[model samples]
Target: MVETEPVQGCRDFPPEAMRCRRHLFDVFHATAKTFGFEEYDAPVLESEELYIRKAGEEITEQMFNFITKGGHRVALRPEMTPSLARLLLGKGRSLLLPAKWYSIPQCWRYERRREHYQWNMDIVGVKSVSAEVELVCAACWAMRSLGLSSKDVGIKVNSRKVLQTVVEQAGVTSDKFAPVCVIVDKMIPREEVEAQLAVLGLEPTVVDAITTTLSLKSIDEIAQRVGEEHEAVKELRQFFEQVEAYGYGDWVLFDASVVRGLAYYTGIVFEGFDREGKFRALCGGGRYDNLLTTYGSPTPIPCAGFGFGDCVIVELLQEKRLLPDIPHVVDDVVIPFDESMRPHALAVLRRLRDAGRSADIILDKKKVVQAFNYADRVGAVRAVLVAPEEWERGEVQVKMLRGFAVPLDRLV
Candidate 1:
């Protein structure tokens, strides 16, 4: 047998995998719809300049870019944000503020190919912290849509202003902001990151104190030591207060440790985690107010958002056994026994469909048993079988998978 080439990184999902994906999408859609998030999409390919526009200097080359046959610098979309921004910028004037939208765009990242498909739900064009709250709620809805409650998952939130306050108070300059925050975010093995920074000339004394500070659980502790005078602390306080108002205060716990390892985020930021107490961060995003300003449209308009990959969500759902294998789609299938009965079969299918049922015509050469099995397998609740005898008398057999098989005559 000849072997076929499999796409790198992207898995060739079998039936079970595709079923999981569909269920996940359904959950996402249900949750988003409940919150009024309209579904939208961006082009899969775009100018390489788009990715270079905002993703920062470090991950630019990680993008899968190549020239088109026409020699244009086109590249596959590495992230959905840029594409969304492109769409937004074009329709920015027409699209309403707090333009809420959700998308399950297939994003590409070479270094982190493990979870390439990103199921990102975003609340764009909104400036309020409540916007952040709604986005988080949408994510929560997605989970519930999949039959998992907040008890099964949790959202961990943090503000870079809080962390940046600590960094600046330590006399670190703005340029070293990204690196030091990156170090602090790896707060997992505390000593490893500190040890790495200590070698890079961060005074061991400051590193030790930063380590202790990074471990603090409350924003009060941060403000207590750093003094409440700094701008960063004030912003952090406001963000936390907003999180409280959302009544998700319980879900929105502060973790000075979450730096998100990104430079673009300027204000309130957050990430979701598996809350079954296993303590794994599921998805996270935050306000990057300076992003648009940096892209040459400098406006006071503040913004925040996050990305949750399909990989970890599916992973956690599997681990918790919360994911469901959605039943096969049912579009009515009509079974006609012979040439003479085709009209009768078509009529039955039409009746069911006209009565608001999704009907399909099964014009197969297979055995009737096989056809009936297909209907049941495909979730067809009503399968109409028209035989010559039944057709002559204006009668049809309706097989209800969940009910008894009955033959009836339509007066019409």
Candidate 2:
């Protein structure tokens, strides 16, 4: 027999699980719309070259790729940003500025044979730091929509430029910055980073300075260490002030540690994590000012956004007891007392459904007690009974599963 179980890391969403998934998707959609971001999508199958050119080291190896029979190599979309960039650049000058778009696309990767949904919100063609501000606010809004508060999660903001300042000041050359970023993003201990930097031929003293800089806890500490005159420091301070101006300062943090582990980020980067440290990152992204340029665009397009996955978020909501009760499939089940009244039972089901009520009829023609039990099991709010005597008397019995019963006019 064929295997009946889902592949490892993948999921089969049964009705109950599907309800939760749908509820989350609804919130994602409603929240994005509330933020004036329009939805978009791309084909799951995209050219492998597209990913090879733009997907950072983080996703390069985990890509699910295969060569098609037509001799074209393609891969399942590992993420949505590249596709968004492609769409925006493909349209070129014809499209409007500051394209505010979002998507909840199913993404796959080989790291786990798992397919997951990602809620991505991006603002393209905007050069100001306000793009980051709005995107961060949008993410916080989504958390609030799911009943999470600032006490439950935090937005840890940092800058690639800040790291650049530290590295340059530490004697690492401009040519080695990207590779060094890839190494520092691992979030390993300082000794390990120091040792790794040694392998990279970085001088011992420079490695010590680099590791020490990354360890700073707050913006002020980093500013004091790296000098407040640096552009990275000034930009971050301005961002924090603006976040407070926008009233989201309570949920924001300025830490030097959030390098995002991705090399594409050229400026400010951030990650959203649970305050209690019970789950992995709930979302992450930042400015990738050079990403479009890498994709053959004539000029760099300033972009900032974030992607939130469904798994950890659902877990967080469950931990907080905020999962709303999803309504049952059927609102009412129609049962006939005998085969003679089966036609009338079907009529009642149709009438209820036509009146905007979710209704179904018992095909088994079971006994009234058994029918009532089935209704209770299926969570029907009401059960309409078609008995021979009631139908003959131009009446039908409506049993309120939650409480009472009453007679109603019968059509037949």
Candidate 3:
């Protein structure tokens, strides 16, 4: 029986559930590589101060924070973007331009424990929407590879830079900018979002404009209502154009309301969401050109990437009935007899291993059923039963566990 006192928003999944997770991870890793993004892994645990500096108070307060016995303040990572930025700092000045990188890291968040693992990927040092286009296309292709259509899953691309431009054009600046974004990001909760704006000291006129723009669903209407003269409109156009050039126009959509809610986002920000709205977002990321400097250096770098968690994605796939079955386990199980035919089973097992086959021995002397159970459980293709009788007669019982069994003599 499971405990009733488990933490909120967290879950423990079973083997069948993990099958779906692995499928998405496989496609994500392969597609990332196909787009020339190299795989990477970072330490799961890091200093609390490091995460706090990048995530700000709103997040830091909700994080899983603790002090070690050694008197070090440590934290479980709630998100991966900051860690990726921290890693680039290790690179120093002498490094590759536009590092195309990816990682299926398991991230943690305290305020939300529903997701324990998130697959994060990033492309560092590239500033253009073209790089953003590549990132989105890779994610879209990954979903499609897993048999999801544009109708099933689509990416909502928006720009923090564009939003910033619009906000600035409407007279919001500096400290107010961050608070305004935090409010605007709450696009779905209109009244509560406006309440946040009111707390942020937004002028009535500015609030009106912001509210109207946030409510506007169509991309063109936002571009038109906000005036095409702003850089926000121009960049929004460029983003879509690049998505078009990549031939994923159908799989991508523009939403002015998607602010992604993180303060480090210096320019464009976007995230992937299930089109049917049946589950949480699939993955999402945006340009955070200022993140490099936030960690103590002033050198500006353009970065665009996203993270896909292992939890809700599996739920969505299973809900859609799209997940694939686990691959066949093994083809053969060779069990050598004691005191007589040990050499024969060892030879067969070695041959199977050499041929890239999976085989194991019947470890128990009395219970042959246990060995057969192991073979069946592991989905072995076949099992070879070698007993004292067979050893003396120069023969063995070859059983197809999935089908039938037969006796065979050694090829002497």
Candidate 4:
């Protein structure tokens, strides 16, 4: 009776594990719905070029791509943003603006199904900085719903615009801005960053200025150097003000070094981190205004969103002992006293179920003691006894699995 195991990095979710996953997904869906976000889904397989053109090179390396039997290049989606872009682009001109949408998609990578669940929330067609603020607040709300607090997690906010401004002012040309930003996003050693910048043809002074600007801890410090009237500084100030207004100021902090690694992130960005600093990124995302345009749409759509995955959060929950005990709940079980009462037991089961009670019937007649044992094992709160005499008398015995009995005039 032996068989092969599941593929590497894949999982077989037995009853308990399945319950845990369902529990988290339920919380994620509930929190998103409370924020007025409509839930959505898309095809798991998509055109490979859709991702390659927008998702950057690092992700493209991890994609699980293949040629279909029809000679088309398709890939198991490594992320959801590109697919979302395709979907929105297809519905262009008719869909309402400022759309709040949420989705929990199962994404795959090349390293063994590498399948993980991602909870995504996005605001579309909103150009104001408030959209990014709202997205951060929503992320905080989701964490709070999961029993986490400011003490358990913290939001690190940064802006790509701010970083780009710093580099450009340091004499780094616009063409080199992207590559330099990518390097700074890594937050590697300062010397290494400077050396890389030197290779990019940036003057020594410009390289030093770029490194110094990234080291500043607060937006104000950045403003003092980049000029107070700079749009990047103004936008960061306004975004932080809105975050405080939303009552989540304590859960978030400004850090200039958090230039998110995604090239498509056109503006503000943030990442969730464990307070104890023990886990990998809990989630990460930011504004991607040009993603739709990358999908062939004539006009760029303003978008901001974040994606939280299931793995690290669940692990954190387990570490904090906050995982819920989700047991299977059965309201009642019907038992026949003897073989002749099987039909009566079935009728009782049917009536109880039709009455909106969670009920089931024993497979066959059994001794009262054994039936009660099975009923307890199944976690049924109550057991109904079906006997020929009881049926003839137009009554049935309802036994509380905990201990006690009563007579019911009807099956329910």
Clashes of each: 10, 0, 5, 0
Q: Which candidate is the best by TM-score?
A: 4
Measured against the true structure, the TM-scores of the candidates, in listed sequence, are: 0.84, 0.90, 0.87, 0.92
lDDT of 2 by residue, 1-412 (tens): 9999988888998888899999899989998999999999999988988777432366766888899998999999888888998898899989788789999999988965468899999998888788988889889988998889999999999888877877787667776777677778777576776676677778877776777777888888877887888878888888888899989999999877777766678888888999998999999989998888988889778899889999889889998999977766678888888888888888777878777888878888578899889998888888888887777766777877763334453322
Candidates in order have lDDT scores of 0.69, 0.83, 0.73, 0.82
> For model 1, what is the error of residue 292's alpha carbon versus the real structure, in angstroms, after optimal superposition?
0.7
**Which of the numbered candidates is closest to the native, going by highest lDDT?**
2
Off by over 4 Å in 2: 53-56, 169-175, 198-201, 226-229, 324-329, 392-394, 403-412
For candidate 2, list the clashing residue pairs, or say none: none
Error of 4 at 12 (Å): 1.7
Question: What are the runs in model 1 whose C-alpha is more than 4 Å off?
Answer: 13-16, 53-61, 70-72, 91-95, 112-115, 188-192, 195-209, 228-247, 276-280, 329-332, 403-412
Better of 2 and 4 by TM-score: 4
Model 3 Cα lDDT, one tens digit per residue, 34-74: 89988878888888877654323355556777899999998
Error of 2 at 200 (Å): 4.3
Error of 2 at 35 (Å): 1.0
lDDT string for model 4 (1-412, tens) is 6767877878788888998999889888888888888998999998887776432345667788999999999998888888888789888999899899999998888743478999999999998889888888888888888899999999998888776776666666676766676667666577886787678788887877766867898878988877888887888889889999889998899887787666678888999999998998888989988877766789889998989999999999889888977777699988888888888778778878888999878896579789988889888899887877767777777888753344554445
